[PDB]
Design a protein around this ligand. Structure first.
Ligand SMILES: Cc1cc2nc3c(=O)[nH]c(=O)nc-3n(C[C@H](O)[C@H](O)[C@H](O)COP(=O)(O)OP(=O)(O)OC[C@H]3O[C@@H](n4cnc5c(N)ncnc54)[C@H](O)[C@@H]3O)c2cc1C
Ligand SMILES: Cc1cc2nc3c(=O)[nH]c(=O)nc-3n(C[C@H](O)[C@H](O)[C@H](O)COP(=O)(O)OP(=O)(O)OC[C@H]3O[C@@H](n4cnc5c(N)ncnc54)[C@H](O)[C@@H]3O)c2cc1C
Ligand SMILES: N[C@@H](Cc1c[nH]c2c(Cl)cccc12)C(=O)O
Ligand SMILES: N[C@@H](Cc1c[nH]c2c(Cl)cccc12)C(=O)O
Ligand SMILES: [Cl-]
Ligand SMILES: [Cl-]
Lengths: 517, 517
């Protein structure tokens, strides 16, 4: 079979430029890559929060160290997501926050520390789970950097940045390596009688042909949805939000610092993200138009930040779900053309490079063996549905009952069998997936992470933070007092490390300034 | 002169039965009215959107309160038309909607609030015009009823209903009051040598005579066009659409509510109406066969609602324009036999009862003084051409340039001097027609409304919603800072009222259910 020689990518957003740069890197020889992007159709870039695999799977693959790309996209550090007002009727007099941290909880004699923490809590211990089981949250409260001043990493972390600058950075990188860039707009897609894409007709009269087409056209799914008519599986029975009102807000970094984390602030009918960088934070009230008008959401959002009627707003809508198949015939959808999940756990750009990684793992020749795309499609389904369930798990486990939106989340969602099973194991007191690896190994072993994306620590951070605890601690632990004592020593180590970080890390603001102002 | 004694109405659609019932009411004494309608020729009833004058001019005249006719026609409430994707290249990621609301914008020291809104916008104010100047659009976004639960009206509104049931309701009403109903089909019309209608010959052998004939035969204009040969002024140089593909679509009212408004969803080569009622919405893609085939339009329409090849479709065509004269000799055309304009602003049934109102205002004796019909004809010309221009104003002011259809609308339409003049005044920053009345008074003073049908607020809703703003705010306002401050207080009142409506109105779905399931 003849190899894929010509590849056309439609779209110049994060997805398109990730596709171009990843493919130019992966396909060392025999690949002519052309990216077409409209000057008249905006890209989506709201100020984006990311996860550690962005470096390990994407930028390492390209050979670009963090210190190289990060200042060029005005990047800032993210060590967690902090959830605010998710636990109860929010009360202005009560500190209701919890973190979802990156990295693994240690095990003690084959049992995660989360489980020894729960046993302690049963005996009256008051410290919240993540403060007991992770060394860094206090440091995040102090707004400290994830690294010592000399760059030595001290916690697992990822990044906040404007996705426009990332696309820009990658456009530059990809074009210097031979990606052909066409600024133009596809207006028509011709399919042959078998349903394979033949060519694209552009507004300026170009006809584009390729062996393989990558649809990075964004939510419109120009190729996959509009031309190939792949059904989009609407998942608004799983997740209620379908909208956002977003903006960027100046930050007084010198008086207030830069939070080394994304915040998710629960609202009446959704939640608001906060994504700090130097000088500004991006923020969006993600909402369900079924429970609040865009009008009321906008008022709620402005009021949250003390913003004025003169404040500019980005009024976004989205459909939650994914294509029935990401790759149909000679077209692979990547990015918003493939799926969307609300940014509650920073998985959007993850879906782009994880899908690109999978595409190269299932790379076709010009015969397009359906066994390859079928395998690829099943990986994407698992990747997305798994994240959808984890995100959904933040909603149906809420104890908030103070609005129709929160009541509908408690009562009216459709739950996969897979999520119910996990919730059942959790409530029984069983660990979810645990690894013996350290973080370095986990984040270096993408075939493992991709299939074991949400571990025990991730579920515990969310479920325990939300106030849903297991019915009881692990029965095994009643037979293991020595193991319980060793766990105490591990809790004491973690506390030592927290205290060392407190006095050793530079502020996130100072460290960011030091790298590049 | 002998009075009109015998009146024959040809046609049993909305127009015929409105004519019968209006005339039986108006002509208290000396009137024998006969309506002939074919059992073999369908009526036009697609699910119809209406305006507040339907109650005030038509049903009040008959003495039928809203609460009486409305459940009998399975009516639902309409508080606006919402225009979707009319502003730009539609983008699935962007909320592009605006409302055209019923009712007046308040004035502040002789200047409409629209003008104070524009000055604010010049200074960076971001709220869309209709959300600033009207209290109800947020409530429509929340799908709320126009009335409190006890029926107290809270906004100006009209109705959605199947026009078949209205005809049915009025048939019953008119026959109980002495209208003679003949189910039969006119096959021939005899004119005397002077060109006056002598009699109608029916398929079943009846000969019908009358002093006055009302042509409600629909688009075929059996009497006015076919028998009297009155020229129809084709207006396809003004407006491009000549076709519709229509259907009814089930609605999940319990999960999705019932939108208290008509939607107009701009397509590639026209627009699609949505007209919600209980259990279903009527919908039609109105299109120009010059830019899209009926085939492609049908595919576009099915795709819009995720409908299947098994979905039933009503494939409509129409000619846009009006008779040179509505009333010729002893024949008055009323309804589709008289004129057609696409349903972009819900004027079809309006044309029926406004024309009937005018007919009674110009009512003849058997001498048929041409001065009466000449006056009547000039009123109809003004009524129709005025609406034609307002509808046309939605098209030529578009910023959409993404298809041939939208480009032709931007560049290729014939514009009346009257519409150019208005657009010129608008762009200069001048108010169009303003009233000092409240809505109640406007909607109660039909001689005023009929001549001042589209006010400043109506033009602003459309022009501002479409993104065509005046070159600058009213120069007068630079001399009136106190007036500007008073306008602020009025903007604050409107916001208070919006917020009160949000928490006080029942959902439109709940209120409709409560009245009659
Ligand atoms: C509200 C919101 C919040 C988000 N938050 C996060 C977050 O915190 N973290 C994270 O990782 N991700 C987040 N995401 C996801 C992320 O922003 C996007 O997935 C990502 O930035 C790339 O989107 P895309 O490239 O698939 O599509 P787009 O950005 O929509 O780019 C589309 C491209 O296709 C081109 N195009 C479209 N049609 C044509 C055509 N006809 N001819 C030629 N070109 C065409 C456009 O010009 C553009 O270049 C968020 C997304 C949304 C909507
Ligand atoms: C696509 C479309 C969308 C519309 N949307 C709206 C809307 O949203 N809001 C609104 O207010 N209006 C709307 N209208 C207009 C409205 O539907 C019609 O004007 C109205 O319902 C009445 O039409 P009519 O009675 O004049 O003619 P028809 O409904 O066509 O009725 C014709 C009658 O004449 C009879 N007839 C014809 N020839 C003979 C004959 N030879 N002998 C005996 N009887 C005969 C027929 O049997 C029938 O009874 C719309 C119209 C169309 C076409
Ligand atoms: N395997 C993923 C899990 C994850 C996705 N988003 C996260 C966030 Cl936002 C915080 C903590 C962990 C995650 C990771 O550790 O990066
Ligand atoms: N004088 C008319 C103007 C009008 C016709 N159609 C409309 C619609 Cl569909 C919305 C708002 C106003 C109108 C009215 O207010 O009813
Ligand atoms: Cl995301
Ligand atoms: Cl109409």
């Amino acid at each position: 079979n003849k190899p894929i020689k010509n590849i056309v990518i439609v779209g110049g957003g994060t997805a398109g430029w990730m596709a171009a740069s990843y493919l130019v890197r992966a396909l060392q020889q025999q690949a002519n890559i052309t990216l077409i992007e409209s000057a008249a159709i905006p890209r989506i870039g709201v100020g984006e929060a990311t996860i550690p695999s962005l470096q390990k799977v994407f930028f390492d693959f390209l050979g670009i160290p963090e210190r190289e790309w990060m200042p060029q996209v005005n990047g800032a550090f993210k060590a967690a997501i902090k959830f605010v007002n998710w636990r109860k009727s929010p009360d202005p007099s009560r500190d209701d926050h919890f973190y979802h941290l990156f990295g693994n909880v240690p095990n003690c004699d084959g049992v995660p520390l989360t489980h020894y923490w729960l046993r302690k809590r049963e005996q009256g211990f008051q410290q919240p789970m993540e403060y007991a089981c992770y060394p860094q949250p206090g440091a995040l409260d102090g707004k400290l950097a994830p690294c010592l001043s000399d760059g030595t990493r001290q916690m697992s972390h990822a990044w906040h940045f404007d996705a426009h600058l990332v696309a820009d950075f990658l456009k530059r990188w990809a074009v210097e390596r031979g990606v052909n860039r066409v600024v133009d707009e596809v207006v028509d897609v011709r399919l042959n009688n078998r349903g394979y894409i033949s060519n694209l007709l552009t507004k300026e009269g170009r006809t584009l042909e390729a062996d393989l087409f990558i649809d990075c056209s964004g939510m419109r799914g120009l190729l996959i949805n509009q031309a190939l008519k792949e059904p989009f599986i609407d998942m608004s029975d799983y997740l209620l939000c379908d909208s956002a009102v977003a903006s960027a807000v100046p930050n007084d970094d010198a008086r207030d610092g830069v939070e080394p984390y994304t915040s998710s602030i629960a609202m009446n009918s959704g939640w608001t993200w906060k994504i700090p960088m130097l000088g500004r934070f991006g923020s969006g009230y993600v909402f369900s138009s079924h429970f609040t008008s865009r009008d009321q959401a906008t008022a709620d959002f402005l009021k949250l930040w003390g913003l004025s009627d003169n404040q500019p707003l980005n009024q976004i809508k989205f459909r939650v779900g994914r294509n029935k198949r990401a790759w149909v015939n000679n077209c692979v959808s990547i990015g918003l053309s493939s799926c969307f999940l609300e940014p509650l756990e920073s998985t959007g750009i993850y879906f782009i490079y994880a899908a690109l990684y999978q595409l190269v793992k299932h790379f076709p020749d010009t015969s397009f063996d359906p066994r390859l795309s079928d395998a690829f499609n099943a990986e994407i389904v698992h990747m997305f549905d798994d994240c959808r369930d984890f995100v959904q798990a933040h909603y149906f486990t809420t104890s908030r009952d103070d609005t129709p939106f929160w009541l509908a989340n408690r009562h009216d969602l459709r739950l996969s069998d897979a999520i119910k099973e996990k919730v059942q194991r959790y409530k029984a007191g069983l660990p979810l997936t645990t690894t013996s690896f350290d973080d370095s190994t986990y984040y270096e072993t993408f075939d493992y992470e991709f299939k074991n994306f949400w571990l025990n620590g991730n579920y515990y951070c969310i479920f325990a933070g939300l106030g849903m605890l297991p019915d009881r601690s692990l029965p095994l632990l009643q037979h293991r007092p020595e193991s319980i004592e060793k766990a105490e020593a591990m809790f004491a180590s973690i506390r030592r490390e927290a205290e060392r970080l407190r006095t050793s890390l530079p502020t996130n603001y100072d460290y960011l300034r030091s790298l590049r102002d």
